[PDB]
Every structure is written in structure tokens, then in C-alpha cells.
């Protein structure tokens, strides 16, 4: 990804691409 | 909370890392 006006799924994808296979605590309702 | 910055404006790698596990 590239720095932009993220939200939701794109934000979850960005967090995964930054943090790696580790995972992260922000997972929203969809 | 993250949504107050990164759904309204830009999240970047160094800010996104703060929500890494």
C-alpha cells in the first residue's frame, strides 16, 4: 500500500502490511 | 482511538506500527 485516506478494510490491510504475519488488535465490524 | 485519525485522514507506517501487537 501507499499513504492515503485509509479506513476499514484498507486500514486492516495497511496494519497487516506494516505489522506483518504478527497481526493487530483493530478489526472492525463489516 | 485509531478511527479518529486513520478513517478521517491519513495513516502512515510509523503511526500504523503503534497498533501492531
Curated annotation (Swiss-Prot), chain B:
It comes from the Eukaryota. Disulfide bonds join 6-11. This is Insulin A chain. The lineage of its organism: Eukaryota, Metazoa, Chordata, Craniata, Vertebrata. The gene is INS. The chain holds residues 90 to 110 of 110 of the full protein.
